[PDB]
A paper describes a structure:
Ferritin from the marine pennate diatom Pseudo-nitzschia multiseries (PmFTN) plays a key role in sustaining growth in iron-limited ocean environments. Typically formed from 24 subunits arranged as a symmetric, hollow sphere, ferritins take up soluble Fe2+ and catalyze its oxidation, with the resulting Fe3+ being stored as an oxy-hydroxide mineral in its central cavity. The di-iron catalytic ferroxidase center of PmFTN (sites A and B) has a nearby third iron site (site C) in an arrangement typically observed in prokaryotic ferritins. Here we demonstrate that Glu-44, a site C ligand, and Glu-130, a residue that bridges iron bound at sites B and C, limit the rate of post-oxidation reorganization of iron coordination and the rate at which Fe3+ exits the ferroxidase center for storage within the mineral core.
Two structures were obtained from E44H PmFTN crystals soaked for 45 min (E44H Fe (45 min)) and 3 h (E44H Fe (3 h)) in aerobic Fe2+ solution. All three sites are occupied by iron ions with modest differences in metal occupancy regardless of the crystal soaking time. These structures revealed that the coordination spheres of the iron ions in sites A, B, and C are markedly altered in the E44H variant relative to the wild type PmFTN structure, exhibiting what might be described as ligand scrambling. The side chain conformation of His-51 is altered such that this residue now coordinates to the iron at site C (Fe-C) rather than Fe-A, which is thus coordinated only by Glu-15, Glu-48, a water molecule, and the bridging water or oxo/hydroxo group. His-44 and Glu-130 are ligands of Fe-B. Fe-C is coordinated by His-51 and Glu-130 and forms weaker interactions with Gln-126 and Glu-47. A water molecule is observed bridging Fe-C and Fe-B. As a result of these differences, Fe-C is displaced toward site A by ∼3.5 Å as compared with wild type PmFTN and the E44Q variant. Structural data showed that, in both cases, iron at one of the sites (Fe-B in E130A PmFTN and Fe-A in E44H PmFTN) has fewer ligands than in the wild type structure, suggesting that inequivalent Fe2+ affinity at Fe-A and Fe-B accounts for the loss of positive cooperativity. E44Q PmFTN has a rate constant ∼6-fold higher than that of wild type, whereas the rate constant for E44H PmFTN is about 3-fold lower than that of wild type PmFTN. Mineralization in E44Q PmFTN was similar to wild type protein (initial rates of 7.0 ± 0.9 and 4.1 ± 0.8 μm Fe2+ min−1, respectively), whereas mineralization in E44H PmFTN was significantly slower (1.7 ± 0.5 μm Fe2+ min−1).
Residue numbers in the entry:
A (entry chain E), C (entry chain A): 1 to 158
B (entry chain F), D (entry chain F), E (entry chain F): 1 to 159
Write the structure that this text describes.
Amino acid sequence: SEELLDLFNRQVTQEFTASQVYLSASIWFDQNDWEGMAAYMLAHSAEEREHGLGFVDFANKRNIPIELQAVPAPVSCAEWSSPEDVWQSILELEQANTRSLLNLAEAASTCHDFAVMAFLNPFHLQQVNEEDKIGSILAKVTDENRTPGLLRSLDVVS
Amino acid sequence: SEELLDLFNRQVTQEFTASQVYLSASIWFDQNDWEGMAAYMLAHSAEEREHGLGFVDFANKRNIPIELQAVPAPVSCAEWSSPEDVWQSILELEQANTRSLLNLAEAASTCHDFAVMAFLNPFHLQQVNEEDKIGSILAKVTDENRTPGLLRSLDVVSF
Amino acid sequence: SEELLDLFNRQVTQEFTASQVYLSASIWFDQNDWEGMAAYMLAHSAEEREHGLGFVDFANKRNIPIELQAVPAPVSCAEWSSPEDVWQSILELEQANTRSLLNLAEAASTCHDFAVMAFLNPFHLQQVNEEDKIGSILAKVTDENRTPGLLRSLDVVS
Amino acid sequence: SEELLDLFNRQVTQEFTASQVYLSASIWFDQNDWEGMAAYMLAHSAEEREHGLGFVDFANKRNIPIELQAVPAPVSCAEWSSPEDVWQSILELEQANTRSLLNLAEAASTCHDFAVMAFLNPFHLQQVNEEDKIGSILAKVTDENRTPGLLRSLDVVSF
Amino acid sequence: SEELLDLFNRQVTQEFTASQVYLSASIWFDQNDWEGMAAYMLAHSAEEREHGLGFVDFANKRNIPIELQAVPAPVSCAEWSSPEDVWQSILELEQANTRSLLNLAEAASTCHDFAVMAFLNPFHLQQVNEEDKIGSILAKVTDENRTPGLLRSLDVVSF
Ligand SMILES: [Fe+3]
Ligand SMILES: [Fe+3]
Ligand SMILES: [Fe+3]
Ligand SMILES: [Fe+3]
Ligand SMILES: [Fe+3]
Ligand SMILES: [Fe+3]
Ligand SMILES: [Fe+3]
Ligand SMILES: [Fe+3]
Ligand SMILES: [Fe+3]
Ligand SMILES: [Fe+3]
Ligand SMILES: [Fe+3]
Ligand SMILES: [Fe+3]
Ligand SMILES: [Fe+3]
Ligand SMILES: [Fe+3]
Ligand SMILES: [Fe+3]
Ligand SMILES: [Fe+3]
Ligand SMILES: [Fe+3]
Ligand SMILES: [Fe+3]
């Protein structure tokens, strides 16, 4: 299906869009002196770009033509006013990256595209790990931010 | 699907049930002075526990509520009176572990739960290997036990 | 001596019962993003199972017939709503593990079973250490949790 | 001599035929839980393939056209019902590999093809060693199988 | 308690008696070409001597007078005519070593001799292990000896 091919392309776009969103979070954090959260965001910005590159390389091998799309300007930073806002946006982004992976897998399953399904398996599993991790950070952030200054004291951790 | 959550929970209970059945087998072997077969069973009891803990960890990560169930008393050690009986029970146990993983996978499949299916793949292949290994032990035991004392003579050598 | 045998059997069951309660605690902690406390509980679950295995091994050597019982489902996790609740249950578990060791010892002492008494000596000493360690963590948990978020900030540490 | 070219080509087919017969034997052994004898056969299947590839390489170098023939289905695994049957077939197989090398050498000899004869010398001596080894295995199997379970007891120890 | 001193002295004699019984067993095994079982017995003869020397040393330290008694001739080697007979005697010997340690401990206990009881604890646990090991050997011997030559075949492999 040209549609399975669309969805695979769209996954590339989604990983690069996520890369930029993470970068935007790193900027917000740095500008507000949360250098720890900033470094985490930057490293994860690079990792999303790596995912997208992984998809590109597979596509090239499997003759799925890739048409690189615009990477949209991230928009959530206009509204962010605390670390909790940023982490909630990042969770939402990953929950989205996951849904788009599952849509892609459904299409591949419908088309009997065994190679594409196999390729995706480690990404399905990585997404479970990432959502769990982000969810856990967000819950720590939310809880520590109930006492003034205390969240800051644990950016100084990680 | 509540059914999927359910089957996932039950797989934990299955792995822990298996862990206890292996422990039971180790005891029987030790009590009847088959230390080599007893060691094998004990190690495999640990491994089944690790499997169950694997499932627990993934569940936690994927927000599948785990409720720990009673781990039944192993009762196959009532009817055991030779090593063949024990290995036969262990074979049936793994055959059941396999079937329950396949049922789990089919529920995942119906639900399009690609992450659960991916998680299960190495277990599917492990079970193939375990059933084969167990099968092959049981064959060997059954053949060797046709001569008095000969099986004993290879608890020593192997294991 | 049937009483000593029975108590020896129940001790195995008590260890495995405890293992499951520790597993249940690690689950509650993980679900609630206390990964540190979760890890402590998981390690201790393994340890409890090791203690049970220890009793099994001695029993086999000493011809104490072991019949493996059911390991009852843990039921405290339904009532836990904070780390404090979890640690308080685990303390109570260890106090019970201790009482049942002392009963088993007393039975052995009545029977003049010097080998069983000697076998049990390191376990008595280990219970003292565990009760102390758990009581101490509970104290620290109870104190830290008087300030919102502060406990979180110290799961992340130790 | 077209006859020499021919016999040279056929030796490749012989080595590959042997490779498959060994593979067949491994399968039979594995299926009947003789993992040690199955490993031996598998390794020897690889080795026969290497022999055939040796012949191919020399042919290429010496401008003897190689045309690859069908590699027949191994069918001796129809009649196998004990390890003795399998080892007996393998012995006959090597006896045939030997005879075919000797026929090859005799054709070379008639043609004064000193390079082919030199090439063959290590294979002649290898076959002597293989027939002896196989022979000795088969004797051992046949003796051990006179007591129930005893052969099994030495798939474990040896191999 | 003179009774405690006494029982302590007798335990030395017991350990040395055991040492000689093991030596006797080694001789029987060697004479009948069971070199592996003979080695095991010889090593265990040394170990019993070490036990007796342990008791002597503690006694000296705790001012319990030691008077060395005659070490009886081992006479169980009159009735031995198979390895089973020998291992059976060794099992009974350890059962007696255990009982005598327990009697010693009970005397200590009555006398509130906490240092003697503490000294004995590792021996109590060692005896548990030795009786289990011996028991398990004897089972294996008895099973293997049901087929002619088979026991011999595992003096070689084990030990
Ligand atoms: Fe399209
Ligand atoms: Fe398109
Ligand atoms: Fe397009
Ligand atoms: Fe991604
Ligand atoms: Fe990501
Ligand atoms: Fe990632
Ligand atoms: Fe399992
Ligand atoms: Fe298993
Ligand atoms: Fe497994
Ligand atoms: Fe415990
Ligand atoms: Fe504990
Ligand atoms: Fe402990
Ligand atoms: Fe060949
Ligand atoms: Fe060959
Ligand atoms: Fe060869
Ligand atoms: Fe001794
Ligand atoms: Fe001893
Ligand atoms: Fe000793």
